[PDB]
């Protein structure tokens with residue numbers, strides 16, 4: 001079961017969840033809240049490493065991640081990020097989202113973007129109970145044209161699903177959770193497994 | 194919850210939910226209804242533009258979309274569409290689906306297709322409450338072999354999820370909704386943002 | 387509605403849902419159970435066929451699938467599977483999952499893996515009511531770096547959703563279901579449509 005729009009307006013009013021800044025009524029409809037693109041990005045520098053050993057020694061993996069991740073890219077007023085075909089890039093939502101322990105969220109892209117090949121997640125679209133922060137986007141252009149991405153554009157949508165009860169280990173309280181406090185286009189922390 | 198098969202049917206029998214043509218009992222099972230491939234398609238003509246400015250002047254964006262989108266391709270009797278690796282294409286379901294205001298739908302592909310790299314959407318698989326029309330598919334072949342797609346084949350599945358209450362702004366009543374009355378392989382309408 | 391962590395443990399304790407071997411308490415949190423990577427894999431040999439006719443004559447599609455699928459790869463001690471960008475591969479979960487008729491499951495990847503371009507499904511991530519078996523993974527590396535995959539690593543997550551009632555035609559009792567008794571990195575069986 002997903003919250004319908006009116007109830008998404010209720011839970012937000014009651015402080016039962018937060019979306020900050022709160023999108024206006026034109027962006028909350030059906031069973032979703034549209035979210036917008038942030039202004040921070042990250043690309044990959046493949047020429048500095050041969051591969052990433054996903055569950056290899058913690059040192060080697062971290063040293064490798066730091067080599068291949070560009071610094072954070074902050075776009076000027078007016079400026080675009082050009083996502084070319086076959087290029088993976090990290091980005092972030094403009095909105096911070098905060099979920100309570102008895103709610104899980106789900107990130108969709110958009111059908112208009114799908115029809116041009118833009119994926120807004122790479123089979124990871126769950127926003128956990130107790131989550132609090134801006135959502136990091138993993139963009140991939142699977143289409144035939146480069147796509148200019150500009151801060152503020154509508155980039156996806158969130159839907160919300162009550163859990164069967166409150167989670168006993170929500171994200172804000174789990175010791176080995178990787179992405180609390182995340183505020184920009186944060187790189188993989190697979191090294192922390 | 195999602196509706197189980199008997200409850201999917203019950204909803205079809207009451208007429209709230211509607212699928213046209215209605216698939217037989219052999220294609221409604223577990224918590225899904227199988228859907229089939231239509232006969233309309235669209236490809237991209239990248240050579241006529243440099244890029245698409247997703248958030249750029251409305252006039253630029255439409256003019257560019259019209260140049261890159263092919264003529265609808267209509268396949269007659271057992272003609273195939275050849276989806277080659279790395280090629281994004283648009284297609285449609287054979288079935289029209291109509292949802293009421295208190296229900297949201299979700300499009301899956303198929304495991305058998307996944308194992309050959311066929312994606313049936315590009316992180317956009319929500320069918321909204323109030324939606325009424327054929328579903329546009331954004332195909333991408335991520336595998337190593339070209340795949341021949343024929344009309345009538347089983348291409349995906351739908352599951353259905355009651356909302357917490359009836360949506361106040363369902364898709365059929367919302368004024369800036371892009372894809373009401375969708376009956377073929379309709380191209381992106383990101384220009385109408 | 388998804389089961390929260392305490393409710394997942396309760397259903398495991400009841401036994402009609404089951405995950406063998408059962409992951410410890412550290413791996414069940416929020417609304418998910420983490421799953422791990424198994425030791426069996428498959429690649430494609432494209433050089434033996436021109437294409438696969440998804441709904442062409444049964445005997446010629448079974449012949450083509452047998453020619454393009456490698457036999458099963460079983461990795462030796464401390465050995466890795468190297469997933470190069472743009473290469474599709476099949477794998478399997480370490481865990482066997484068994485769901486009852488009144489429950490559907492959903493496979494996520496991981497945000498840490500998404501941020502390096504690793505997809506763990508190809509728009510097919512529904513685990514059906516009545517399902518029983520190891521889950522076959524369709525991996526694709528959409529990133530810039532090859533990724534070394536080692537058995538035992540955390541590869542994804544499962545969430546669980548009660549159905550409106552028990553399915554009348556769950557997966558275990560359905561005569562044209564393709565993937566019961568599924569043990570390794572089983573190849574597409576699209577030829578059985």
Ligand SMILES: Nc1ccn([C@H]2C[C@H](O)[C@@H](COP(=O)(O)OP(=O)(O)OP(=O)(O)O)O2)c(=O)n1
Pocket residue numbers: 108109110111112113300313314317318319320321322324327328329330331364369370371372375
């Ligand atoms: N594979 C898909 C997914 C969705 N849709 C349809 C069903 C939805 O109810 C509708 C809108 O989905 P989105 O909100 O993701 O699309 P947009 O945001 O691009 O359009 P809109 O401005 O109308 O919200 O399009 C479709 O035809 N094919």
Ligand SMILES: Nc1ccn([C@H]2C[C@H](O)[C@@H](COP(=O)(O)OP(=O)(O)OP(=O)(O)O)O2)c(=O)n1
Pocket residue numbers: 301302303304305306493506507510511512513514515517520521522523524557562563564565
């Ligand atoms: N990543 C995944 C997703 C699903 N499955 C399994 C779980 C499902 O219960 C089953 C069927 O999934 P689909 O209906 O998507 O696959 P098909 O339609 O190709 O098979 P079938 O004809 O049996 O419905 O396969 C899997 O092993 N790995």
Ligand SMILES: Nc1ccn([C@H]2C[C@H](O)[C@@H](COP(=O)(O)OP(=O)(O)OP(=O)(O)O)O2)c(=O)n1
Pocket residue numbers: 107120121124125126127128129131134135136137138171176177178179494495496497498499
């Ligand atoms: N597109 C997404 C999807 C998820 N997340 C956030 C929301 C989740 O609550 C969190 C964790 O998601 P995963 O469990 O899939 O990520 P990991 O397993 O890699 O991290 P962890 O070790 O914290 O479980 O990351 C995000 O920023 N962007």
Ligand SMILES: [Mg+2]
Pocket residue numbers: 110157
């Ligand atoms: Mg929308």
Ligand SMILES: [Mg+2]
Pocket residue numbers: 303304350
């Ligand atoms: Mg199926």
Ligand SMILES: [Mg+2]
Pocket residue numbers: 496543
């Ligand atoms: Mg996780």
